[PDB]
Amino acid sequence: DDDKLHSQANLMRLKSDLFNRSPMYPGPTKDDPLTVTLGFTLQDIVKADSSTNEVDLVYYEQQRWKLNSLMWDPNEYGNITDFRTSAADIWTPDITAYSSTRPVQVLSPQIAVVTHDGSVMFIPAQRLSFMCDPTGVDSEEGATCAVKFGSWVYSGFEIDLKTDTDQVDLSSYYASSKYEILSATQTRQVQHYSCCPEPYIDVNLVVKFRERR
Amino acid sequence: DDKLHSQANLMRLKSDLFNRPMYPGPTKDDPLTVTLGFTLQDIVKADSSTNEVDLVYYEQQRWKLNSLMWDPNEYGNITDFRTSAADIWTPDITAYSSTRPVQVLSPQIAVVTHDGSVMFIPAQRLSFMCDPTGVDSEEGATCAVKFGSWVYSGFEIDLKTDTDQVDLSSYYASSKYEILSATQTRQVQHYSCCPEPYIDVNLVVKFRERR
Amino acid sequence: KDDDKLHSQANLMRLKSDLFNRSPMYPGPTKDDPLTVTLGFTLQDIVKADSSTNEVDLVYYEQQRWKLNSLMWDPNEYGNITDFRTSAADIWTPDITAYSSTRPVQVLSPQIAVVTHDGSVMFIPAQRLSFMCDPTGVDSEEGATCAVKFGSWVYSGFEIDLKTDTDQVDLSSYYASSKYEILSATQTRQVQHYSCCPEPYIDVNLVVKFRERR
Amino acid sequence: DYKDDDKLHSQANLMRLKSDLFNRSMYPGPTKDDPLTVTLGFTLQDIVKADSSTNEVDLVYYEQQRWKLNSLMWDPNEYGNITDFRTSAADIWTPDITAYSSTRPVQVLSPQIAVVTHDGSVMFIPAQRLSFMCDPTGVDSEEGATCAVKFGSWVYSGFEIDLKTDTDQVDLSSYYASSKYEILSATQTRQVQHYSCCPEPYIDVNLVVKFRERR
Amino acid sequence: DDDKLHSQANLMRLKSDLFNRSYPGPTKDDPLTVTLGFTLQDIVKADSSTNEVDLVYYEQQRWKLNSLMWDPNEYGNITDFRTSAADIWTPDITAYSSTRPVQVLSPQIAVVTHDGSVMFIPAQRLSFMCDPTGVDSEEGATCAVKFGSWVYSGFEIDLKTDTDQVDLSSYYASSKYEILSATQTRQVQHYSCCPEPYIDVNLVVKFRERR
Ligand SMILES: COc1cc2c3cc1Oc1cc(ccc1O)C[C@H]1c4c(cc(OC)c(O)c4Oc4ccc(cc4)C[C@@H]3N(C)CC2)CC[N+]1(C)C
Ligand SMILES: [Mg+2]
Ligand SMILES: [Mg+2]
Ligand SMILES: [Mg+2]
Ligand SMILES: [Mg+2]
Ligand SMILES: [Mg+2]
Ligand SMILES: [Mg+2]
Ligand SMILES: [Mg+2]
Ligand SMILES: [Mg+2]
Ligand SMILES: [Mg+2]
Ligand SMILES: [Mg+2]
């Protein structure tokens, strides 16, 4: 206790200084662009509906970005290096699947981890239905599917996207899924439209899969 | 540092426009024109036992409010910004013959530009009334649904399209259904119940089972 | 030009702010100040009849009308505004409910009303309803008959009286390619008395006879 | 008129009343020193469905809830003779009466509004659709299937919340005449239970239904 | 009638002092132990087309904060109380291999005791990754799902069970599935990326079609 009481007190002081003086960060702009790193950890192809061409995925989607406005000096806060906080208390990026066919279902607590250098890690678990023809899922080559993820409203001048590796993390893939993974890549792409001079960034999730035996 | 002066300018801009009374919507004396456009991504499902068809599309909405205007020079050259759709008024555009609530697939964020213009592009899945008869045939099926304001007549909201062609350039190439044609047409209507003019955009889609 | 537009806009702000205060939300009807709600249905589709569970699914506009002194204003003090649109959450709405649904109603329309300067309100929620209905004989010429009551969940006739403007359901919107065709569709006010109580209960009983399209 | 005045004055009596019970003053719930009796009663409307590949049955019913709070009493003569009012269920405390063996969330089908009367008593009657645990084995027979589900507080033991019924017969005067399922019997019975783990009594109302396919 | 007003004002008084005269979650300095146990009511559905299985259970969560302590003597000898689960902090315990959002079957209400202990027992319906193959045989099928904080390491939240027995005394005797065995076991996990320990409770269930 006491120190415990003071530890608590430090965090609460940190949280208020960060949030309640200087209202919420207004998102990136062309002047103050931001890079968002994404990585997918695929857990499960739950279902492949060949009457509709929809496949359902369960995955953890890791988001990392970093904001100056969220740094503090740990020395000033009883040496708190980082803390967990609700996603409602901070700006999060608007990363969406560009071809889902149902609202994404969130499977995990909406809480992020923020570090003293202003970097935020946020890892939502999701079930997604997206546009995918599962033809050849019963063959040796299996079926191939793709879905792009990106910011819904920000172009490349405000949000840049990157990955650590083009390899999707399969280390958590359900061993007894109806389907088995031949490959899972996650690839940064730059889209140019003719309408518009600004580039748009997405990460392309490509999965090649196949009925298990 | 300069990066912190931009944030500050934006925060200030948003506060001026939002924290200092939300537009109460259009009036006969002060009507609004909303531009609509569809980008058909997919016909996911044709249900011949209930006559329901499920579409996924982007729905572009565009409009312009004087009270959303600023002079960029007083805000460090900011020419536009992105903000939650909750912060502004948005039009009550709806499908007139859906059979399930629409399912919003994209985040509710809008871009506001310094001339007061707003662009909002919700992705949707919609079930609407549609007889898919003929879909298994060279000529395919034709379906139609209308969109417009739910509570404003054409004295308050007028609608408009940029082209009467649905944008099909992201239509999903391995859909169960290919598209023969897809058109979005402004229409003005007079109903016996109701003496005000009614404006809608008619979405007409001819489609067949892929081969 | 932009100046005419700003005053008219500010006159609406003013009207709203004046109505939605002094003296905030009207507490609902009483025995001393009862209220009459007119309903009318506009049937768009019988989407589905499930004979394995005896549930049928209707899509309709449920048109509701009523009048509140508390929502009156003089157009003259408000730059000639005779009516305006407002989210239904800003005002009191009646608790009209199907008595025999089997799923929560799904709302298919923005929930916004029209208030006119005499205090009258017009509110048109579009709905999809699953209600108890045995669709037997639907595949014959004489078809099936199903019925559902709508009324206030909690007010007696001493507080909310219902009426219809007509006993016919409005079919002008009915989908010409539904699996189901309408033979008749009526909407009739009924007064019920129970045995617990001395107060009457009012409902509009919606009766639909339908069959498969051939 | 001086009717348009009286009306105006009936509204202000109600708005005032609501203001004195609601803003001025919110029951923190029952306690061991201040227990509460909840009266429960069912009006069964329909057995909508019986899944025998999962052993779920879906019922539709209205659940009558009734209790009384000193803190909700008022003197009608101070309030223009108002003897009772309607109000959103969110303005008042309500009991956590729950099904103990539901299998998906209860579906509410009626507006959440209660009636409060000057003696401090509240009647609240939500219509609901419940999926609960039930084998319909033998539903296609003469003798039928039996199912049970208990209802009662989720977190209050009998020392804080007690339950009673006005009758043991579930009310069937609104059962749907053309349901797939007719009702052989439906009863609603107060049970008291005592566990080893625990000194306190546990109250529930046991809802039991014998039904068979309509034939 | 007057001592009921008293004891009532006392509780109100307590809730005031606890909740608005006044937890930001646990930390490395101030860690917290959550005790969990499961009461399994039903395996509703085992789906071989998708490899999902649906359970109905009560999940007891139990923990203790110094900040919720009080001295009964100063509060009419109130020894505990019930309160909405939004009035207080709760731990982010999460199934790590669910495939649908958990559905809540019970009122979101907790019991707070004067020593600052909190007990929270939500009823849930869950879908999780489970191959039901063999459920039709005598040896049944076996499925596991781990449960843990999503965002805190072992440095801030530790977990425990009072028993590794999943309590089956309320199992639905008429389920389609009979439980062969059901356990709930703490697990510590050490990774290559990370010095932090990671704790979960592993819910493992062996079950077969009822005979
Ligand atoms: C299958 O859909 C429709 C089918 C048919 C029609 C309109 C439809 O629907 C659409 C419906 C509106 C607007 C644009 C549409 O494209 C309706 C409307 C509405 C309002 C107020 C009302 O009373 C005061 C009312 O009756 C209304 O409903 C009508 C009015 C006329 C008709 C039917 C329903 C006949 C019209 N005719 C040619 C037959 C074919 C205000 C706003 N809303 C709610 C939008
Ligand atoms: Mg740009
Ligand atoms: Mg008009
Ligand atoms: Mg006409
Ligand atoms: Mg008008
Ligand atoms: Mg009465
Ligand atoms: Mg009465
Ligand atoms: Mg007790
Ligand atoms: Mg107790
Ligand atoms: Mg850690
Ligand atoms: Mg840490």
Keywords:
homopentamer; 213 residues; mainly beta; Acetylcholine Binding Protein, Chain: A; four-stranded antiparallel sheet; 12 strands; 8% helix; 47% strand; binds ligand TUB; binds magnesium ion; choline-binding protein; Receptor
In percent, how helical is the residue content of chain A? under 10%
How far from one another are the termini of chain A?
57 Å
Strand % of chain A is over 45%
Determine Rg of chain A (CA atoms, Å): 20 Å
Domain module count of chain A: 1
Structure summary, number of beta strands of chain A: 12
CATH superfamily of chain A: Neurotransmitter-gated ion-channel ligand-binding domain
Task: Report the oligomer.
Answer: homopentamer
The rough form of chain A would be described as: globular
Bound ligands: the ligand COc1cc2c3cc1Oc1cc(ccc1O)C[C@H]1c4c(cc(OC)c(O)c4Oc4ccc(cc4)C[C@@H]3N(C)CC2)CC[N+]1(C)C, magnesium ion
CATH architecture of chain A: Distorted Sandwich
**Major sheet attributes of chain A:** 8 strands, mixed
Structural class of chain A: mainly beta
What series of H and E elements makes up the topology of chain A?
Answer: HEEEEEEEEEEEE
Please name the two chains that share the biggest interface, counting residues whose Cβ lies under 8 Å from a Cβ on the partner chain: B-C, 29 and 35 residues
* Continuous helix count of chain A: 1
CATH class of chain A: Mainly Beta
CATH fold type of chain A: Acetylcholine Binding Protein, Chain: A
